[PDB]
Amino acid sequence: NQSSLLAEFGDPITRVENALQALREGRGVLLLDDEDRENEGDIIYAVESLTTAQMALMIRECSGIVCLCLTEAQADRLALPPMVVNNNSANQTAFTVSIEAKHGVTTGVSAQDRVTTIKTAANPQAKPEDLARPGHVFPLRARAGGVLARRGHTEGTVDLMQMAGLQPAGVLCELTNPDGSMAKTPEIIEFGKLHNMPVLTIEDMVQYRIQFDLKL
Amino acid sequence: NQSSLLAEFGDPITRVENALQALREGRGVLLLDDEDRENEGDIIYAVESLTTAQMALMIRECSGIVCLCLTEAQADRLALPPMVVNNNSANQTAFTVSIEAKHGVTTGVSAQDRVTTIKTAANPQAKPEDLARPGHVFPLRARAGGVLARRGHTEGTVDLMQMAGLQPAGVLCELTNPDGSMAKTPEIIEFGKLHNMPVLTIEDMVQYRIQFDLKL
Numbered sequence: 001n002q003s004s005l006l007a008e009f010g011d012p013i014t015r016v017e018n019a020l021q022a023l024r025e026g027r028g029v030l031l032l033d034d035e036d037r038e039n040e041g042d043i044i045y046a047v048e049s050l051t052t053a054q055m056a057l058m059i060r061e062c063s064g065i066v067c068l069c070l071t072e073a074q075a076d077r078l079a080l081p082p083m084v085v086n087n088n089s090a091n092q093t094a095f096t097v098s099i100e101a102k103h104g105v106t107t108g109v110s111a112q113d114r115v116t117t118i119k120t121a122a123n124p125q126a127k128p129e130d131l132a133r134p135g136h137v138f139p140l141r142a143r144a145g146g147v148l149a150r151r152g153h154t155e156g157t158v159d160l161m162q163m164a165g166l167q168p169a170g171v172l173c174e175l176t177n178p179d180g181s182m183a184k185t186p187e188i189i190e191f192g193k194l195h196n197m198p199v200l201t202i203e204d205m206v207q208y209r210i211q212f213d214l215k216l
Numbered sequence: 217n218q219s220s221l222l223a224e225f226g227d228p229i230t231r232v233e234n235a236l237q238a239l240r241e242g243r244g245v246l247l248l249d250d251e252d253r254e255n256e257g258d259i260i261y262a263v264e265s266l267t268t269a270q271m272a273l274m275i276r277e278c279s280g281i282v283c284l285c286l287t288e289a290q291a292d293r294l295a296l297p298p299m300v301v302n303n304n305s306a307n308q309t310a311f312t313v314s315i316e317a318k319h320g321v322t323t324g325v326s327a328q329d330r331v332t333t334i335k336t337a338a339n340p341q342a343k344p345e346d347l348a349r350p351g352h353v354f355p356l357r358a359r360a361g362g363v364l365a366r367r368g369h370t371e372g373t374v375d376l377m378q379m380a381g382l383q384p385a386g387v388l389c390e391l392t393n394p395d396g397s398m399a400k401t402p403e404i405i406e407f408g409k410l411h412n413m414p415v416l417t418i419e420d421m422v423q424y425r426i427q428f429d430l431k432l
């Protein structure tokens with residue numbers, strides 16, 4: 001079973017603390033959602049320490065639809081409307097219009113360019129004119145309340161950043177197997193060991209956030 | 217120089233004929249745009265022969281923002297508005313709202329699911345309700361006139377399909393190097409040799425289309 005597989009990484013509280021510490025150190029983590037939701041694991045990085053090398057890893061090992069988790073306030077500051085008025089996708093992932101930095105990029109799609117775009121968008125001083133639309137970076141609006149309101153990787157990302165004491169902006173993308181199938185827990189665990197990334201679940205985060213009276 | 221590098225693949229007319237034949241056979245090709253435009257090479261596949269294995273290759277070797285080139289008529293049939301009213305991106309790539317099949321997929325992001333979504337969308341009998349929005353497939357509207365009107369990989373794709381006698385729907389995605397940089401001509405040539413894919417340029421196509429009085 002899943003929790004038995006993850007025991008390696010420690011019990012739920014340890015799995016959360018280790019993830020937060022990795023983020024504080026500028027490393028990435030792997031977040032699994034509920035087995036009866038997507039049963040998918042996303043690579044998560046903090047934006048403020050994001051490197052080209054981390055983005056290149058995300059592009060070659062994940063779906064390549066690298067998303068930028070933003071707060072509602074930041075998405076509003078950037079004047080980023082939802083991509084679709086009536087989102088009728090299964091999970092209602094809160095995709096905004098896609099974005100590209102106006103300055104400092106070429107075609108927008110290289111690892112370096114995506115990082116430039118992401119840092120431009122996450123800048124607390126950012127203005128809407130800093131971003132062209134559409135582009136190769138896919139911002140998302142996190143629900144107020146984080147994983148205590150919606151148990152998606154989007155909310156996982158913002159909560160991890162806030163709980164680690166970091167700026168509330170992160171990047172995420174679904175870990176994909178070489179044959180195009182999506183990674184499941186055994187592959188995610190092995191990837192985490194290979195790349196020295198902690199693994200944790202949304203459930204771990206919800207338990208942690210509820211037990212430590214953590215309002216963010 | 218570039219044309220010297222591509223001489224291996226034949227002269228421009230041969231490069232076009234070989235690409236068309238590969239597509240007719242159900243294989244992929246590599247299309248370079250102008251050196252003073254993106255100077256990027258995209259993998260291109262015909263939709264009607266698209267396999268999970270071809271999509272998996274695109275995801276692991278390219279940007280992972282796998283696009284679906286549609287005619288304006290097909291995009292209209294699907295009720296796919298442009299993602300942004302005033303596209304202010306550099307190349308004005310005609311991204312529609314992103315899509316996911318309503319039926320036959322799980323999370324939409326696996327290689328198989330993206331193919332399911334693409335075939336659902338490309339179906340000449342498709343209806344708007346067949347697709348949820350947003351999703352993990354990124355349709356584009358090709359300009360009327362193809363590469364004789366706009367010299368983008370979008371138009372390259374639709375023109376290759378029409379000239380090969382295939383349904384005018386293809387998938388495309390930018391070839392990316394392992395370190396996250398974008399592949400340039402030497403890397404594209406080597407990739408084409410490895411995967412037995414023909415390489416050609418948009419210029420090749422424009423010359424071919426103008427000399428063979430090819431109205432599509």
Ligand SMILES: O=C(CO)[C@H](O)[C@@H](O)COP(=O)(O)O
Binds near residue numbers: 042
């Ligand atoms: O699932 C995804 C997209 O389909 C990715 O993990 C990310 O974009 C967050 O989305 P979320 O898990 O919150 O729905």
Ligand SMILES: O=C(CO)[C@H](O)[C@@H](O)COP(=O)(O)O
Binds near residue numbers: 308356390
């Ligand atoms: O460049 C791209 C996106 O940035 C891709 O090749 C494709 O989506 C077609 O776009 P195009 O080359 O026609 O602008």
Ligand SMILES: [Mn+2]
Binds near residue numbers: 107109254307309
């Ligand atoms: Mn481009």
Ligand SMILES: [Mn+2]
Binds near residue numbers: 033152
């Ligand atoms: Mn997810």
Ligand SMILES: [Mn+2]
Binds near residue numbers: 209210213214215
């Ligand atoms: Mn609480």
Ligand SMILES: [Mn+2]
Binds near residue numbers: 091325
């Ligand atoms: Mn998803």
Ligand SMILES: [Mn+2]
Binds near residue numbers: 254256258368369370
């Ligand atoms: Mn292109």
Ligand SMILES: [Mn+2]
Binds near residue numbers: 425426429430431
């Ligand atoms: Mn003509």
